Design a protein around this ligand. Structure first.
Ligand SMILES: CCCCCCCCCCCCCCCCCC(=O)OC[C@H](COP(=O)([O-])OCC(O)COP(=O)([O-])OC[C@@H](COC(=O)CCCCCCCCCCCCCCCCC)OC(=O)CCCCCCCCCCCCCCCCC)OC(=O)CCCCCCCCCCCCCCCCC
Ligand code: BCL
Ligand code: BCL
Ligand code: BCL
Ligand SMILES: CC[C@H]1c2cc3[nH]c4c(c3C)C(=O)[C@H](C(=O)OC)c4c3nc(cc4[nH]c(cc(n2)[C@@H]1C)c(C(C)=O)c4C)[C@@H](C)[C@@H]3CCC(=O)OC/C=C(/C)CCC[C@H](C)CCC[C@H](C)CCCC(C)C
Ligand SMILES: CCCCCC/C=C\CCCCCCCCCC(=O)O[C@H](COC(=O)CCCCCCCCCCCCCCC)COP(=O)(O)OC[C@@H](O)CO
Ligand SMILES: CCCCCC/C=C\CCCCCCCCCC(=O)O[C@H](COC(=O)CCCCCCCCCCCCCCC)COP(=O)(O)OC[C@@H](O)CO
Ligand SMILES: CCCCCC/C=C\CCCCCCCCCC(=O)O[C@H](COC(=O)CCCCCCCCCCCCCCC)COP(=O)(O)OC[C@@H](O)CO
Ligand SMILES: COC(C)(C)C/C=C/C(C)=C/C=C/C(C)=C/C=C/C(C)=C/C=C\C=C(C)\C=C\C=C(C)\C=C\C=C(/C)C(=O)CCC(C)(C)OC
Ligand SMILES: CCCCCCCCCCCCO[C@@H]1O[C@H](CO)[C@@H](O[C@H]2O[C@H](CO)[C@@H](O)[C@H](O)[C@H]2O)[C@H](O)[C@H]1O
Ligand SMILES: CCCCCCCCCCCCO[C@@H]1O[C@H](CO)[C@@H](O[C@H]2O[C@H](CO)[C@@H](O)[C@H](O)[C@H]2O)[C@H](O)[C@H]1O
Ligand SMILES: [Fe+3]
Lengths: 22, 57, 274, 50, 320, 258, 53, 50, 58, 50, 22, 50, 45, 45, 50
């Protein structure tokens, strides 16, 4: 069930970077 | 008695009357609701309690 | 000794009783007739307290306890060792407090000021008179007054409060506390605002009414103004004492049961009565 | 004129006011007639009985 | 008699005062201010404008949620009966958690809602403290208001946050209700043996009484000298006038010493601040280092020796 | 089980209490020192003997004022000069009062007629160096509110019922938007200012009542150096003159009434 | 009767009417929930009631 | 015009206001008919009696 | 009804509407959580409560 | 025009307001349909009876 | 009952996006 | 322009706001998918029943 | 809807929306922690 | 996203973010420490 | 630039902000990995079961 925490923690972080390059 | 409106401003009278009539009607409806005889929803007030006591330590 | 600007203000006059006989200063203090009377009552009352302490079992300042007479004595003057000394000290205290207020009136008149200060102090005197004469009079016994002792009079407050089993439910008590708490909040705000304006960050100019009124309009949307806040300070403090006097005068002369029971009038209003 | 209403409009407002008062009362009368049918009030000294 | 300056009937309408220009980057002030004659009687007549920065809006949102938690649970505690809500409103509360759960998160029905309301309300209060601090800086004022506010927050945190942590239970914290939080105050004194004998409770009362004494004295002093422009206090501080001199001489001739128009506000500032500072300390001591204040008072020689007028009685539980 | 015990008799709550006493003693010392930033050192009945009392006077602090009206340092190394008050001592020993001289005691500068030598310039507004107090003929953006009295055109009456003049204009505070002075045209064509806190506006009879001065004593009230602004010192002069009437207007007001 | 919107501000009347009707509707919906018979969520017989003779 | 509207605006608002009042009331009438079917109110003095 | 927006400020309406709708939705969700039948988290079986009249955990 | 809106920019707002209300209402309607399937409300006077 | 939460969570987002692109 | 922004920059903010909204929503959707996998909600009237 | 930023300050919208979302997210996490079934730390009882 | 720094002061954001992140971390640590399972000092009871 | 930043310095801060945000998150990710190794969360409906 580690996958639950991995997405909610990492995916927002990647979202900030991906929204930042544009 | 139409002259009553030459003396008092109609805007205030209607607003004062509307507020007065609603509060009175709300008062009367609530007094009847609190009675056993004129309660139109459930009738007499049974005073239901919680299903179980909170357990002792 | 006098302040640098003081000498021009030391004029003759303003007295109510006596005139020029007592119209003089001792050090910084002005005397007048009521200063003589206040000094007499204060010294005699204090000396009687020490004598009552000498008759007691301890010299511990916290444990000295001078008690009123028994309830059975009613409104009579008790023997000195059985509450009579308390009655004499009470009379001295009443005389000292009234003389102090009347002395302030003369001082304010000598300076051409309004009488707002003695007016405000009179409400403190009213609360004391309620505790020691007005409430005992309605109960018919001087024994209802609180004992004179630093920690012993807290015992009277505690036992008196539990004679109604929950004194927080006293309605005038709630109002008086609301005034005391609001007055302290108002005092903290007022003291802060003046100091913040008079003491800005170092090197910055002092700020005036524009920032003072602007500060509370920014934070709360309204400013009462400099005149309003000092009116509010008197009104809150005076009403705290007035409603304190009300809350105790109704406790026993006009209410003999538990205070929470008094709220049954609200619970039994016909709009929602069970 | 303290109110400021002219004579023509003041009489017109009174006509509307009286007409509205009549309609409001007439509905209330029928409402009380229905309420009395459902549950009467004004009991005897010994109660409503049944 | 003379005009007592109780209230002001002669009033003038000037242009609305929006305040000094704000520092670059600040928001615009909210609302169009208007004159109100009713408030002009006792104080200033202008209502608004208001400044709503980040701290203000964040505090409102946090605080509103906390208020909703209290109100919804209060209304649910009367089974959504509005007539019973009005009848029982003073008696209702959002109760703190049961003693079983200690410092952990309680279930919603057994104190979980209380903890969330306590968190959101505390966040709102702290965010309001930032607002009081930052609004003072934006105007070039000192931060005396914020630090006085921090004293009030200290008592609030001691009652609901610090002491329950020191005691190991959120159950020791006050409830969110009007009459119930009076019950908690009385039950607190009953449990810990007559809080009258808490010396920091004595001091807090001395300053609470003292705040009433000072504001009555100071307000009366200013009102008695409004004929000399005494209410223009900051101008009296930087350039002393006859109002300041008479105010100082009134108290010097009355009791032998006096303050200044600046230092009196320092006396008032500290007396109000010490109410909650000494009060907060006293609350943190009870149950943590003192369990019965009257017995502590007896130990430290402050219990007056009241006579016992009854025959001696023995605890019947001992002989059973 | 003795939690909080330091020794057999000293416990933690006791130690915290004595810690507060030390702080409170320091706070009272600090507050008393701040009290001594005005009027100290004290003057005695000796040409060069000054007392600072205990606690001593604090170190100087400086206030920066707006619109280039200078810097103020308190406590002042050299105190401000006092007005030349005219009074005769009632006795030679210390603590005795004095009696103001002159037919008009309100002009003697003694007792309640004394005043401070404040700045001889108008108080300015913060936003602009414009004088804070201005007549409504100049501050045309201020108008009297309705549903409140309008004192313009009222008679100015002393407490003896003698009419001294008519109210011509009102002076407003441009910062707080309130009336501080009523300007009255006296029967000797003098145009004096009367303090609003000492004026009772009776809109029923159209009169402004002065409880402090008789009608004839109003005619000797201070006049402004220039008609469109009032300095801080002039504000003190006007207030002192009117307020001293409560003690000096009649001989009865200065004597014991009972 | 149309000569009322010249007498009363429509903006003030509509806002007052909107607040009044919503509060009234909240009041009635809340009261029904408190009843045993008209509660539409949990239904009847939610607590304990003493038997009557 | 104390309010500030015109002769035409007041009548146009009147038509919209009455129509909205009719629609709102008509929906409420249907709602009360449905509510009465689900659970009738106004019991007898002795109760609803199934 | 497009003519109504010349009389009512769209800024005022949208802000008042958003607050009103959220509070209403929050209230309705809370009311459902305050029922056994419509509690979607723990279900219809209400859990047993602890003793309020209990000593401090020591 | 007390609001300060042109006829062009006010009719457009009405168009956007209506479609947002309809979209919001349609989503809520489907949510209530799903909620009814999960747990119906409005029980009989006897109860839900499973 | 997965569709109960999927609709109420996703459909408003689609509505907002489609309304925004109007 | 009560706000004080030009038409061009309002469009750019709208594009960034909607894109950020979509990214935030999609992450939330996957989080709810994972949360449902860990512990489903919306039980039957008889409970979750293991 | 790109015109909604003409009448609404984008700075004010983001601040209010940012605080609202964080408060709502805190509210939901707090509710779940206080449930028996969805408490992810100590688990069900 | 870099255009946000033309809308919001970076100095204001950093201090607000620092306080927000510290209080959030303080809250999470406290919650874990008050649980039985995740108490890292005294451990499970 | 309502904030008062040029294009050059706004880009510079954004680059540093993202790098610091990435570095902070990466350290936190490894911290959670170690925390999961010490004590996993998200139990099954029957509990952790040792
Ligand atoms: C709590 C405790 C509260 C205790 C309050 C004590 C108040 C004492 C009043 C002192 C009056 C005075 O002269 O001020 C001196 C002193 C200032 O002295 P100074 O101006 O620096 O010295 C002047 C020169 O020495 C030059 O001074 P001087 O030589 O001109 O001074 C002479 C002065 C004598 O003064 C002294 O020598 C000093 C005495 C110190 C004791 O006057 C006299 O000679 C009196 C003669 C006897 C006749 C008095 C009665 C006549 C009738 C008066 C009317 C009725 C009364 O004022 C104070 O010390 C006040 C500090 C007290 C602060 C209390 C704050 C409240 C705390 C509450 C805490 C609650 C929670 C805990
Ligand atoms: C039977 C009861 C006990 C007793 C039990 C207690 C207890 C318990 C306490 C006191 C405390 C005090 N007691 Mg006691 N006290 C007794 C008898 C007295 C008597 C008397 C003559 O009998 C007096 C005058 C006092 C007076 C006092 C004060 C000196 C002191 C309160 C300070 C204060 O202002 O807090 C009021 C100010 C606050 C509480 C801070 C508020 C600030 C925050 C920020 C408010 C935020 C509001 C928020 C934004 C709005 C939320 C609204 C939502 C809808 C919720 N007590 C008897 C012996 N007393 C308090 C104390 O400090 O003791 C040491 C305290 O905790
Ligand atoms: C108990 C049996 C039934 C039930 C019995 C009834 C009956 C009987 C009625 C309703 C009615 C309503 N029910 Mg129902 N209802 C039930 C349970 C519910 C539940 C629920 C969660 O279970 C909900 C959400 C509702 C919701 C509703 C509403 C749709 C409606 C009330 C309209 C209203 O308040 O207008 C208030 C708002 C306005 C009037 C808007 C005002 C517009 C103004 C004039 C224009 C300007 C606006 C201004 C600028 C802004 C201020 C206004 C703001 C709204 C504050 N019911 C149960 C299941 N319900 C009533 C209805 O159908 O009315 C048509 C009705 O008669
Ligand atoms: C299972 C429980 C574990 C545990 C599991 C975890 C996990 C998992 C994590 C941590 C993380 C942290 N833990 Mg731990 N932690 C435990 C026990 C501890 C103990 C202890 C005494 O036992 C301590 C001291 C700590 C301390 C810490 C911190 C180093 C760190 C939180 C960073 C932070 O708050 O940034 C907030 C503050 C900032 C971000 C400031 C940054 C600078 C700003 C942005 C720039 C301008 C600043 C401006 C001026 C404002 C300043 C305001 C002030 C800073 C307040 N842990 C136990 C053993 N801990 C987190 C971490 O490692 O993050 C790096 C993390 O992910
Ligand atoms: C020195 C100690 C004394 C003191 C001092 C003191 N109090 C203070 C201060 C100071 C110096 C302040 O600066 C501060 C203040 O702002 O004063 C004006 C304050 C204050 N003391 C207060 C109260 C207070 N003080 C008390 C006591 C005291 N205060 C002591 C006697 C008490 C008592 C006796 O119990 C109370 C109740 C407040 C008036 C204020 C702090 C206000 C605050 O924290 O505000 C935020 C809190 C909230 C609950 C938020 C409210 C949210 C709104 C109700 C929302 C409305 C609806 C919303 C707009 C809808 C939309 C929302 C969306 C999310 C949908
Ligand atoms: C301890 C108190 C010490 C007080 C010392 C003191 O000063 O008492 C003085 C002597 O009073 C006097 O004997 C005359 C007054 C006698 C005592 C005061 C009346 C007591 C009434 C009881 C006060 O009189 P003044 O001449 O007005 O002031 C003198 C000061 O200016 C000296 O710098
Ligand atoms: C009022 C009448 C008070 C009569 C007091 C009194 O009693 O008169 C005499 C004693 O008065 C005494 O010395 C003391 C006299 C006390 C007078 C009490 C009234 C003074 C009120 C002052 C405040 C008034 C505020 C208004 C006679 O005393 P006895 O009859 O032996 O007392 C027996 C007790 O049971 C009486 O309750
Ligand atoms: C009371 C609320 C009054 C209010 O909310 O007024 C608003 C403006 O508030 C404004 O400026 C901003 C100010 C709004 C708040 C006003 C102050 C509220 C009371 C605070 C003081 C009491 C509490 C202090 C201690 C906690 C509404 O303004 P408008 O709708 O534009 O016009 C109002 C009409 O009378 C004239 O147009
Ligand atoms: C449309 O909405 C409406 C219907 C209008 C809403 C109406 C709402 C109403 C009517 C509300 C009424 C409220 C009333 C009357 C409230 C009265 C409250 C009173 C008098 C309170 C008195 C004292 C309360 C005190 C001191 C409480 C303090 C609590 C504190 C400090 C708690 C702090 C913990 C913090 C910081 C936490 O981190 C812990 C959080 C967590 C770990 C999750 O839980 C453990
Ligand atoms: C203002 C006037 C208010 C007067 C209130 C009425 C007097 O109040 C009344 O006082 C008398 C005398 O003290 C009391 O009388 C009681 O004590 C006295 C004195 O020991 C006894 O002699 C008497 O037998 C006993 O009844 C009453 O119990 C009390 O009710
Ligand atoms: C600040 C400067 C001035 C200091 C004044 C006093 C403040 C500190 C008082 C310390 O008071 C003391 O603190 C320690 C915590 O370490 C605690 O001491 C407690 O724990 C020890 C540990 O064996 C036990 O003996 C017993 O349970 C108790 O004495 C109490 O809290 C109090 O006894
Ligand atoms: Fe002041």
């Amino acid at each position: 069930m580690a996958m639950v925490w991995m997405w909610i923690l990492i995916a927002p972080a990647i979202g900030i970077v991906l929204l930042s390059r544009q | 008695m139409w002259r009553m409106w030459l003396l008092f401003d109609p805007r205030r009278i209607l607003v004062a009357l509307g507020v007065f009539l609603f509060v009175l009607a709300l008062l009367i409806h609530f007094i009847l609701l609190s009675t056993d005889r004129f309660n139109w929803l459930d009738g007499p007030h049974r005073g239901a309690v919680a299903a179980q006591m909170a357990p002792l330590p | 000794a006098m302040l640098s600007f003081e000498p021009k203000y030391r004029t003759r006059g303003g007295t109510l009783i006596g005139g020029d006989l007592f119209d003089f200063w001792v050090g910084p203090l002005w005397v007048g007739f009521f200063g003589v009377t206040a000094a007499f009552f204060a010294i005699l009352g204090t000396l009687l307290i020490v004598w009552a302490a000498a008759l007691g079992p301890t010299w511990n300042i916290w444990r000295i306890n001078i008690a009123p007479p028994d309830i059975s004595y009613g409104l009579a003057f008790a023997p000195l060792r059985e509450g009579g000394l308390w009655q004499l000290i009470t009379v001295c205290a009443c005389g000292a407090f009234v003389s102090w207020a009347l002395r302030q009136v003369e001082i304010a008149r000598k300076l051409g000021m309004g009488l707002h200060i003695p007016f405000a102090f009179s409400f403190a005197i009213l609360a004391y008179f309620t505790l020691v004469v007005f409430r005992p009079l309605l109960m018919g016994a001087w024994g209802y007054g609180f004992p004179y002792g630093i920690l012993s009079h807290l015992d009277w407050v505690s036992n008196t409060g539990y004679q109604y089993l929950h004194f927080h439910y006293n309605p005038a008590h709630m109002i008086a506390i609301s005034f005391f708490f609001t007055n302290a909040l108002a005092l903290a705000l007022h003291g802060s605002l003046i100091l913040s304006a008079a003491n800005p960050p170092k090197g910055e100019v002092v700020k005036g009414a524009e920032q003072e009124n602007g500060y509370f309009r920014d934070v709360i949307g309204y400013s009462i103004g400099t005149l309003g806040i000092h009116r509010l300070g008197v009104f809150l403090a005076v009403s705290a004492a007035f409603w304190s006097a009300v809350c105790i005068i109704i406790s026993g002369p006009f209410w003999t049961r538990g205070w929470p029971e008094w709220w049954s009038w609200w619970l039994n209003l016909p709009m929602w009565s069970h | 004129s303290i109110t400021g209403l002219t004579e023509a409009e003041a009489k017109e407002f009174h006509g509307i006011f009286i007409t509205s008062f009549i309609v409001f009362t007439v509905i209330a009368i029928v409402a009380h007639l229905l309420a009395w049918q459902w549950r009467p009030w004004l009991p005897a000294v010994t109660g409503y009985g049944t | 008699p003379e005009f007592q300056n109780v209230f002001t009937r002669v009033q003038v309408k000037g242009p609305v005062h929006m305040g000094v220009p704000l520092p670059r980057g600040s928001w615009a002030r909210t609302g169009k201010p208007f004159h109100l004659y009713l408030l002009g009687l006792i104080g200033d007549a202008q209502i608004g404008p208001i400044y709503l920065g980040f701290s203000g809006v964040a505090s409102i949102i946090f605080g509103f949620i906390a208020i909703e938690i209290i109100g919804f649970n209060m209304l649910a505690s009367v089974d959504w009966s509005v007539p019973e809500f009005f009848r029982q409103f003073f008696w209702l509360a959002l109760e703190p958690p049961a003693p079983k759960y200690g410092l952990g998160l309680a279930p919603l029905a057994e104190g979980g809602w209380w903890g969330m309301a306590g968190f959101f309300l505390t966040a709102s209060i702290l965010l309001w403290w930032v607002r009081m601090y930052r609004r003072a800086r934006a105007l070039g004022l000192g931060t005396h208001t914020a630090w006085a506010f921090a004293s009030a927050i200290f008592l609030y945190l001691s009652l609901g946050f610090i002491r329950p942590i020191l005691m190991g239970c959120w159950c020791e914290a006050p409830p969110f209700g009007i009459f119930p939080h009076l019950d908690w105050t009385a039950a607190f004194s009953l449990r810990y043996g007559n809080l009258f004998y808490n010396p920091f409770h004595m001091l807090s009362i001395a300053f609470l009484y003292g705040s009433a004494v000072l504001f009555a004295m100071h307000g009366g002093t200013v009102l008695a000298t409004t004929r000399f422009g005494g209410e223009r206090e900051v101008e009296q501080i930087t350039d002393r006038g006859t109002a300041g001199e008479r105010a100082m001489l009134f108290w010097r001739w009355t009791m032998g010493f006096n303050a200044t128009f600046e230092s009196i506000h320092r006396w008032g500032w500290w007396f109000a601040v010490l109410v909650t500072l000494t009060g907060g300390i006293g609350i943190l001591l009870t149950g943590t280092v003192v369990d019965n204040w009257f017995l502590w008072g007896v130990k430290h020689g402050i219990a007056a020796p009241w006579p016992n007028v009854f025959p001696h009685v023995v605890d019947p539980a001992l002989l059973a | 089980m003795e939690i909080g015990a330091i020794t057999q008799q000293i416990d933690a709550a006791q130690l915290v209490l004595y810690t507060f006493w030390l702080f409170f003693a320091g706070l009272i010392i600090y507050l008393r020192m701040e009290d001594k930033r005005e009027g100290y050192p004290l003057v005695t009945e000796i040409p060069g003997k000054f007392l600072e009392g205990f606690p001593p006077m604090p170190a100087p602090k400086t206030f920066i004022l707006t619109h280039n009206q200078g810097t103020v340092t308190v406590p002042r190394a050299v105190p401000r000069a006092e007005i030349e008050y005219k009074a005769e001592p009632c006795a030679a020993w210390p603590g005795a009062p004095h009696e103001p001289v002159g037919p008009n005691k309100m002009l003697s500068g003694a007792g309640p007629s004394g005043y401070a030598l404040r700045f001889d310039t108008p108080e300015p507004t913060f936003d602009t160096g414009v004088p804070r107090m201005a007549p409504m003929r100049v501050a045309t953006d201020h108008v009297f509110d309705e549903d409140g009295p309008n004192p313009i055109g009222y008679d100015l009456v002393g407490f003896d019922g003698i009419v001294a003049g008519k109210i011509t204009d009102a002076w407003v505070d441009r910062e707080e938007s309130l009336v501080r002075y009523l300007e009255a045209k006296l029967t000797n064509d003098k145009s004096i200012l009367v303090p609003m806190p000492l004026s009772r506006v009776k809109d029923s009879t159209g009169q402004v009542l002065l409880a402090s001065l008789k009608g004839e004593q109003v005619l000797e009230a201070p006049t402004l150096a220039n008609p469109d602004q009032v300095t801080l010192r002039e504000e003190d002069r006007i207030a002192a003159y009117f307020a001293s009437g409560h003690l000096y207007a009649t001989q009865a007001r200065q004597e014991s009434i009972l």
